[PDB]
């Protein structure tokens, strides 16, 4: 088989039908293949768990990458003034759930082999009305720069990029599913020029050394040569 490494990893964070808060596309050299050191460290992390190790042993270091996703959105927030107001009101006053969606889409090079260029999926959370996170997110719109909100269980760190179009978080490494996804801290950045440019910034809640990066670990099944 042939290594089938993503050449683009694109992720988004979107609240309801509002203009997406955060978009980012990682490409070379932000897509970092595992070294034997990385593979050893991953193996040490999951050593106590035979199920996890059985999954990991199916992959060579070359089959695994860390997408070092920049947490500052790649684009200015596009939202119109009335929709920004509607979003604030819905967050605060809405009586229905509001969906928060984190998407990922991995592009592959078909010239190497394989048949399915993109493989993707998403994780969604329903933010209940009047919930603390929902009110805190709404509060960020007031533009106090020191403020933030943590959304628990939003970022699936370990994802498989198989030959087919559906890229699921790896259950063997995240056996409690959503409960094993990482918390994400969200902030709104503003620069004075509707008299402010706005963009959103996310980081892993427990980030330490490189809070600007959200490292997504992607296991790619090998592919057959082209035909």
CB-CB contact of 194 with 81 (8 Å):
yes
**Total number of domains constituting the chain:** 1
Query: C-alpha distances in angstroms, 100 versus 50, 122, 161, 169, 184?
Result: 33, 10, 23, 17, 12
Look up residue 128 and give its two tokens: 């209940």
The structure's method of determination equals X-ray
Q: How many residues belong to the chain?
A: 227
Reported resolution, Å: 1.5
CB-CB contact of 66 with 217 (8 Å):
yes
34 is in which domain, residue-wise?
1-227
Look up residue 212 and give its two tokens: 């600007």
Q: What is the CA radius of gyration of the chain?
A: 19
C-alpha 83/C-alpha 25 separation (Å) is 25
> In 10 A of CB 171, how many CB atoms?
15
- Residue 206's contacts (CB-CB under 8 Å, 6 or more residues apart) are 182, 183
């Amino acid at each position: 088989g042939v290594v089938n490494q993503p050449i683009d990893v694109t992720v988004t964070l979107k609240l309801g039908g509002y203009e997406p808060l955060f978009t980012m596309s990682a490409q070379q050299p932000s897509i970092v293949p595992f070294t034997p050191q990385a593979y050893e460290e991953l193996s040490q992390q999951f050593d106590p768990y035979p199920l996890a190790m059985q999954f990991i042993s199916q992959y060579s270091p070359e089959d695994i990458v860390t997408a070092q996703i920049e947490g500052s959105s790649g684009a200015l927030w596009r939202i119109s003034p009335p929709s920004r107001a509607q979003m604030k009101q819905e967050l605060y006053n809405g009586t229905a759930d509001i969906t928060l969606r984190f998407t990922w889409n991995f592009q592959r090079d078909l010239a190497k082999g394989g048949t399915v260029e993109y493989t993707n999926e998403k994780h969604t959370l329903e933010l209940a009305p009047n919930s603390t996170a929902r009110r805190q997110l709404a509060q960020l719109l007031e533009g106090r720069p020191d403020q933030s909100v943590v959304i628990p269980h939003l970022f699936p760190k370990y994802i498989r990029a198989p030959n087919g179009p559906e890229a699921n978080p790896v259950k063997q490494l995240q056996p409690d599913e959503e409960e094993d996804y990482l918390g994400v801290r969200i902030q709104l950045r503003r620069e004075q020029v509707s008299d402010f440019l706005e963009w959103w910034v996310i980081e892993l809640q427990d980030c330490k050394a490189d809070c600007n990066l959200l490292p997504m670990v992607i296991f790619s099944d090998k592919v057959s040569p082209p035909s």
